[PDB]
UniProtKB/Swiss-Prot annotation, chain A:
Attaches the virion to the cell membrane by interacting with host receptor, initiating the infection. The major receptor is host ACE2. When S2/S2' has been cleaved, binding to the receptor triggers direct fusion at the cell membrane. When S2/S2' has not been cleaved, binding to the receptor results in internalization of the virus by endocytosis using host TFRC and GRM2 and leading to fusion of the virion membrane with the host endosomal membrane. Alternatively, may use NRP1/NRP2 and integrin as entry receptors. This is Spike protein S1. The chain holds residues 153 to 199 of 1273 of the full protein. The gene is S. Glycans are attached at N13. Binds to host ACE2. RBD also interacts with the N-linked glycan on 'Asn-90' of ACE2. Cleavage of S generates a polybasic C-terminal sequence on S1 that binds to host Neuropilin-1 (NRP1) and Neuropilin-2 (NRP2) receptors. Interacts with host integrin alpha-5/beta-1 (ITGA5:ITGB1) and with ACE2 in complex with integrin alpha-5/beta-1 (ITGA5:ITGB1). May interact via cytoplasmic c-terminus with M protein. May interact (via N-terminus) with host bilirubin and biliverdin, thereby preventing antibody binding to the SARS-CoV-2 spike NTD via an allosteric mechanism.
Amino acid sequence: MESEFRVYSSANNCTFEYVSQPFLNFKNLREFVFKNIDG
Amino acid sequence: ASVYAWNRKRISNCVADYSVLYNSASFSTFKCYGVSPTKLNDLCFTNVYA
Ligand SMILES: *[C@@H]1O[C@H](CO)[C@@H](O)[C@H](O)[C@H]1NC(C)=O
């Protein structure tokens, strides 16, 4: 059971929020590419 | 809200149809400054503060 979230202490000025569909021996291989081009 | 504590709602990541508001008969003032109401339904903005 997931009952522990300790990643932040505050959230003051939000510009953008986006809720989406979930993306997700070792059985799974997940490749991701993150790019910051022209905003 | 009261005018001293006016509510601000940030509107992002959706489609804003302004012709529904402009063609309503329920509004007495629809005074736009800096832009015309006819091209609001065409133009695109980063955020909307209500
Ligand atoms: C950012 O947050 C601080 C404190 O929460 C506030 O004083 C400031 O006016 C905010 N700026 C914007 C642009 O929202």
